């Protein structure tokens, strides 16, 4: 599944076990022990009553960790990897449905702008949400291969379901204007935002 660092390589079962049950390593570090006890023929519940991690604790460590191998091969800034090291867990979790190049964008932004799993969530969902909008209103100012733009749109999206005027379509195209890098993308907000009644 992942791939089991070196210091560990040479444990049976009980020494993956042990160390799961003191995180005796970073978080990616001790995630494919779990991978690797699964196929010894251990079981997540039974993990998570001999070290405590949560049989979705385990998963969300394991696939997280998968998403960071796949930013490491990928041609990446190297600081970028080094961001996740504590709690990126969560975060890389949420990003697992985009392509490699788009964890790659996805991750930079997350950290960029510092967006907590939740947020995650929404620009994930996002991003994978853009190419399915192609008959929406302003779906052509907005880039689909930056991140921001993407969440920017589903809250422009998001905003058009609201009545005109009021707080909650306020409320949303600032959200849209908040997480948008392209130039078109902030246009169009600005003009709907700020339209000359004000």
């Known amino acids: 599944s992942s791939p089991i660092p070196t210091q560990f390589r ?7 076990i042990e160390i799961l049950a003191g995180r005796m390593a970073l978080w990616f570090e001790y995630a494919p022990l779990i991978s690797s006890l699964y196929t010894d023929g251990f079981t997540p519940p039974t993990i998570e009553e001999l070290t405590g991690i949560s049989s979705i604790e385990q ?13 490491l091969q990928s041609i990446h800034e190297p600081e970028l990897i080094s961001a996740f090291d504590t709690g990126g867990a969560e975060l890389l979790y949420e990003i697992r449905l985009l392509s490699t190049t788009q964890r790659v964008a996805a991750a930079t932004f997350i950290i960029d702008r510092n967006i907590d799993s939740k947020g995650a969530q929404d620009l994930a969902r996002a991003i994978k949400d853009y190419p399915n909008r192609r008959g ?3 779906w ?4 689909y291969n930056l991140p921001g733009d993407c969440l920017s749109f589903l809250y422009y999206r998001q905003s058009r379901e609201n009545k005109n005027p009021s707080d909650q379509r306020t409320s949303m195209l600032l959200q849209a204007l ?6 078109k993308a902030k246009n169009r907000l600005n003009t709907e935002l700020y339209g000359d009644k004000e």
Request: no cysteine; charged share 30%.
């Open 178 to 183: 908040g997480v948008a890098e392209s130039e």
């Open 59 to 71: 998963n969300r460590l394991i696939v997280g960790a998968q998403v960071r191998d796949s930013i």
């Open 10 to 16: 040479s444990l049976d079962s009980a020494g993956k």
């Open 136 to 138: 929406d209103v302003g």
């Open 140 to 143: 052509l100012d907005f880039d």
